[PDB]
Amino acid sequence: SFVPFLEPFIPHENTLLPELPFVTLTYAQSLDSRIAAKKGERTVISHQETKNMTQYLRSKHDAILVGVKTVLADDPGLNCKLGTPIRPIILDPTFQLLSKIASLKLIKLGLSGEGEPPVFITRKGVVSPDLQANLRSDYGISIVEIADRDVHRGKMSWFAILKILKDAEIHSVMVEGGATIINDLLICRQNSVPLVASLIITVGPVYLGKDGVEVTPARSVKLGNVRWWHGIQDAVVAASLEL
Amino acid sequence: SFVPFLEPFIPHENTLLPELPFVTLTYAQSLDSRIAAKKGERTVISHQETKNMTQYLRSKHDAILVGVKTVLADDPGLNCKLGTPIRPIILDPTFQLLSKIASLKLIKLGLSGEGEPPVFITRKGVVSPDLQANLRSDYGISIVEIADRDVHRGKMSWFAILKILKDAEIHSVMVEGGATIINDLLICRQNSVPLVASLIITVGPVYLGKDGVEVTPARSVKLGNVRWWHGIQDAVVAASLEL
């Protein structure tokens, strides 16, 4: 079972950044470190055993965070199949996904009660106040705004984002991806301390090739407390980021 | 131990291409699919357990093959630390190593008896008959030459290379890399049949980043007979390439 394997890595209170929730960074990769096949090819990386492990991990987190690309590519449910509630947080600076709200599965689940209503994290002044009110009434959506003070070289501050989630009583968040989010978080440090508490990676035994969606940080990154697991098809590494 | 794990993957005569040696393609990669750190950085991927696995695999092969880039970067010995003889094979189409021969560790070992005399594979006529005769007398070196009729798209035919090696009574060859060699063999097929018999990959729990030496094939590649192993620090996947 992956259950004892994950036990030191699921959220706990041994945190060096108490202002922030417990952050788990997780994704499924090919051997050549792609997280999605090339345009028009069907992405198959993670097998059922690590889909199960992902659901188990969500059952230990208050929220799950993805970006727009993931939502567009996967139309994911972003709920937990074990039945525990988990709050979907969508990072969407210009609230692009407004145009898709009538179609998205995570909106459907939020309306039916099978899931929690999602949070969209946008720049300040993207969604006017009346629209916010109407989207909350019609879809249960919340809009969380990041002030320009928390936007640096065009990028919303992970520290500021994670603070808001903690302030709203989200004490653990599972960040499930987007190549840009993964690359940024792998190197994001607050005074030498990683924002990521646990790194949990599925490796699928397949190559997606040079036109797949690549994950690789801007510099080398060392891991600690490494442990491996493997099932019938997939392998999983769990680790912390080195100081 | 990795020995029962590798038992069905070490050379054996269940081969669809009897004109060829049993070919193992094997390498060690970071999580982001790099095989060497960026230029000035120290490459640490494979820990002692999979260093050991590689030496065990070498003890089961007649020959080990690498390209020039690997020799220039690593100055590898290319012998087997279990003490079994293994023939080093260097793919050097234009014989770039000419001016470095006396300096190479693999040549030193050939002369001291810790290793076998190496084979260099070049285009035909690259090494003059005078130089070949002196290299054989002074260093034990043999040049294997690939005919013009077996160079296509400017690239030597892997089938032709491997045929000449089987003809020289090399019945198994362990191809340990060069990103280009790995990328090419991952997709090389002879009438749908992969020339690689066994694919064995160490995954080290580290990132090398975007300036490291990347492996990714030109298109997606499927694997069969997937078996995973992991020790205290590294994971290993063993597989065949799908037909």
Please write out the topology.
Two copies of one chain form a homodimer.
Chain A (H helix, E strand, L loop, with lengths): L1 H5 L15 E9 L17 H11 L4 E5 H7 L12 E5 L13 H8 L6 E5 L5 H11 L2 E5 L4 E2 L2 E2 L1 H10 L4 E6 L1 H9 L1 E2 L2 E2 L3 E7 L16 E10 L4 E7 L2
Parallel strand pairs in A: 1-8, 1-11, 2-3, 2-8, 3-4, 4-5
Antiparallel strand pairs in A: 6-7, 9-10, 11-13, 12-13
InterPro entries (chains A, B): DHFR-like_dom_sf, RibDG_C, Riboflavin_Biosynth_HTPR
Family (chains A, B): Belongs to the HTP reductase family.
Function (chains A, B): Catalyzes an early step in riboflavin biosynthesis, the NADPH-dependent reduction of the ribose side chain of 2,5-diamino-6-ribosylamino-4(3H)-pyrimidinone 5'-phosphate, yielding 2,5-diamino-6-ribitylamino-4(3H)-pyrimidinone 5'-phosphate.
Task: Offer a concise description of the structure.
The structure is a homodimer of 243-residue chains. Chain A has 243 residues and is α/β, with parallel strands linked by helices. The first copy, chain A, is built from seven helices and 13 strands.
